[PDB]
Design a protein around this ligand. Structure first.
Ligand SMILES: Nc1ncnc2c1ncn2[C@@H]1O[C@H](CSCC[C@H](N)C(=O)O)[C@@H](O)[C@H]1O
Length: 387
């Protein structure tokens, strides 16, 4: 029975082996997603996003006419974009170019077509009656994007728009109970419960969640953990998040709460190096300045042979730009050799930097043949600390 608990968690299954065994469960799980419905709603949200950008630009006095060329800074200064929001402002122009309203050569911008009248809020409500199931996303897009000009002009701290004290959950319902998040979060749970199904009765398991928010992904895991054999450290950079979560999860008695900034050495923050079996980071690692230093801090927490579970969006999204792209974390990135103009990585980029930062046996999920395109826009990545 008893082997020494000081020795590494050799009992953990391999991510590839976990992926193999869950494969039939995933082929049934991804068909529960509506191919057309989540595709329809995705396209329309990208069209709505344009409306919000045009609405916001006009409210700042945008007066540029077709053929006219302007400089990015000059336009920012004209419309009153505060200096810290010009990165976001550039991306909003890049989006107008994708749809043909603007064109870009050099760092100069030329108007192609005059933008027409928009009422994105009237159209938002239409979408809400059509698709009440994505109400969290439209409500949050409404609160953040219908205030874009306030944000670009620095009159609103976007934190109060995305994560105000009186409402941290709306941003979590997006991460937790959207159609796609339900699939991805179930994978996170099934992966974690499969990886540990060989845990000796003699040994406890230690999990640590980075950037856990108010527990969007956490809530999928906790119902399956064995309180007698588990320690679960709920961390976030913000104390308001851990405090709301402690309220939500108060009757799970095996939970620890603590604050962690994954951009600074976790050992300087009260965390033991290389003594966590499983690290969860859902939708957080991208929001840092250097993925290599961030992933090296993550690696520093993992026991030899321990498991990282990552949940990340992998594609550009205009409606996401109008919510989380308002925040500092979205544009923190400075590792331009890897991330030239957007904080997110695709599946192949994530595998690459993970192998460079001391991980192996990297799996990306789901990978099912006829799955919805929307399942290719997000991924669960499982990787093993390379002993
Ligand atoms: N540098 C950092 N270190 C740790 N957490 C961070 C961080 N920067 C941002 N975060 C946290 O990352 C979270 C992104 S939203 C949280 C998502 C969460 N997994 C959920 O499903 O609810 C925020 O709560 C934010 O506070």
């Amino acid at each position: 029975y008893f082997q020494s608990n000081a020795l590494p968690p050799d009992f953990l299954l391999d991510p590839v082996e976990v992926s193999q065994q869950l494969a039939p469960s995933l082929t049934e799980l991804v068909t529960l997603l509506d191919n057309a419905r989540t595709s329809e709603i995705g396209t329309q949200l990208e069209e709505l996003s344009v409306d919000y950008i045009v609405q916001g630009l006009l409210q700042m006095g945008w007066s540029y006419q077709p053929t006219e060329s302007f400089d990015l800074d000059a336009a920012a200064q004209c419309l009153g974009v505060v200096p810290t929001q010009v990165r976001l402002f550039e991306r909003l122009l890049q989006i107008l170019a994708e749809v043909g309203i603007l064109q870009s050569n050099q760092q100069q911008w030329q108007v192609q077509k005059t933008a027409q009248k928009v009422n994105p809020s009237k159209q938002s409500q239409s979408l809400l009656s059509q698709y009440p199931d994505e109400a969290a996303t439209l409500t949050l897009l409404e609160r953040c994007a219908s205030q874009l000009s306030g944000v670009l002009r620095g009159e609103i701290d976007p934190v109060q728009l995305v994560f105000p004290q009186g409402d941290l959950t709306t941003a979590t319902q997006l991460y937790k109970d959207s159609a796609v998040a339900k699939v991805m979060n179930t994978i996170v749970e099934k992966v974690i419960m499969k990886a540990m199904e060989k845990l000796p009765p003699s040994r406890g398991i230690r999990l640590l969640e980075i950037g856990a928010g108010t527990g969007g992904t956490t809530s999928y895991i906790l119902p399956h953990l064995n309180p007698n054999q588990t320690e679960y450290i709920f961390t976030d950079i913000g104390a308001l998040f851990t405090s709301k979560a402690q309220e939500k999860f108060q009757d799970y008695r095996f939970l620890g709460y603590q604050t962690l900034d994954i951009e600074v050495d976790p050992s300087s923050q009260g965390f033991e190096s290389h003594r966590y079996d499983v690290i969860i980071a859902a939708n957080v690692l991208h929001a840092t300045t250097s993925l290599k230093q961030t992933l090296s801090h993550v690696r520093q927490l993992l026991a030899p042979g321990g498991i990282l579970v990552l949940y990340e969006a992998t594609t550009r999204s205009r409606w996401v730009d109008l919510i989380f792209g308002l925040l500092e974390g979205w544009w923190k990135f400075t590792d331009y050799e890897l991330r030239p103009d957007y904080p997110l990585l695709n599946r192949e980029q994530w595998k690459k930097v993970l192998s460079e930062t001391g991980f192996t046996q990297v799996v990306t999920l789901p990978e099912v043949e006829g799955m919805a395109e929307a399942l290719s826009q997000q991924t669960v990545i499982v990787a093993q600390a390379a002993s």
